[PDB]
Design a protein around this ligand. Structure first.
Ligand SMILES: CC(C)=CCSP(=O)(O)OP(=O)(O)O
Length: 301
């Protein structure tokens, strides 16, 4: 029963994470997994936890695990620091999450882990605030401020989260996609073509019009948007658009959850052409999807 029968919730989680990774051919490191769970296993059992797979072009599927909780302080940072998961790089990322929590009150935070790497991100979730609140933050890439006109033009006025990617050396600003123009396929064409990104099929455009959340990625090495992502939730296995892509089908049908019918969150990423790929998270305990609708002032579907 090393991995079966009666077991703690945390051990069930670990076993499920490894099974997913093996099934999708994701790489992982046993030492990294152990290191993550020593620090964070208890959080994973009691809060909004998700397992993600994503399929970047010309590489293996990546398997991530992640959680969030409604605490005002960035509890992940002290945990990751003591676990040895978060070393200073001599870089703006090093102080960025601390600056985010200083500059804007959080109502929640989270952390994200690639099981082949360690801690990849920490999230800051304020209440929805004007995007200009982010310009207070010292270490934000200069590109962010430079996109003020872009944000206004595409109704990216309502900031709903921030993140720091320690691995990629980037930061995402997340927006509440409230504006009725964001219910039209033309919006998505236009925002993508504004950055010279790949425009997806009409089929996919028709899915994007339900997107409540738009992420925009910025970095310190270039003046432009690195990639953007449109997030859409589905309240059960069957409603995921399994026909769009085999990873969506397989994950929807096979992803483990401790709850008997989980929902999913799908991110549709686009970049130059790479940055164009799909991310899918299983709502392992069933907390994440309701919370996603609630945070965007949407009734649950
Ligand atoms: C759970 C929600 C609504 C957003 C999470 S941010 P993310 O993991 O998709 O960020 P990246 O893929 O690292 O850009």
């Amino acid at each position: 029963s090393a991995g079966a029968g009666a077991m703690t919730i945390v051990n069930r989680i670990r076993t499920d994470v490894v099974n997913v990774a093996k099934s999708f051919g994701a790489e992982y490191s046993e030492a990294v997994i152990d290191q993550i769970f020593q620090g964070f296993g208890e959080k994973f059992t009691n809060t909004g936890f998700a397992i993600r797979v994503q399929n970047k072009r010309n590489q293996k599927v990546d398997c991530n695990i992640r959680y969030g909780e409604a605490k005002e302080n960035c509890l992940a940072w002290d945990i990751a620091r003591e676990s040895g998961l978060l070393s200073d790089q001599g870089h703006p990322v090093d102080t960025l999450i601390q600056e985010m929590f200083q500059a804007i009150p959080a109502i929640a935070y989270g952390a994200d882990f690639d099981i082949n790497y360690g801690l990849v991100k920490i999230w800051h979730l304020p209440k929805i605030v004007p995007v200009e609140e982010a310009f207070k933050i010292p270490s934000l890439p200069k590109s962010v401020n430079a996109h003020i006109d872009f944000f206004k033009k595409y109704h990216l006025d309502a900031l709903c989260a921030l993140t720091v990617d320690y691995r990629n050396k980037s930061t995402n600003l997340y927006f509440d996609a409230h504006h009725p123009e964001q219910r039209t396929t033309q919006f998505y064409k236009n925002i993508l073509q504004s950055q010279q990104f790949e425009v997806p099929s009409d089929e996919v455009l028709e899915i994007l019009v339900n997107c409540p959340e738009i992420a925009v990625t910025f970095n310190w090495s270039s003046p432009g948007i690195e990639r953007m992502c449109f997030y859409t939730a589905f309240v059960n296995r069957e409603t995921v658009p399994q026909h769009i892509n085999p990873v969506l089908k397989k994950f929807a049908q096979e992803a483990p959850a401790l709850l008997d019918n989980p929902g999913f969150l799908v991110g549709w990423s686009f970049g130059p052409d790479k940055g164009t790929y799909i991310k899918i998270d299983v709502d392992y305990h069933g907390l994440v999807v309701p919370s996603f609708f609630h945070m965007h002032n949407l009734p649950l579907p």
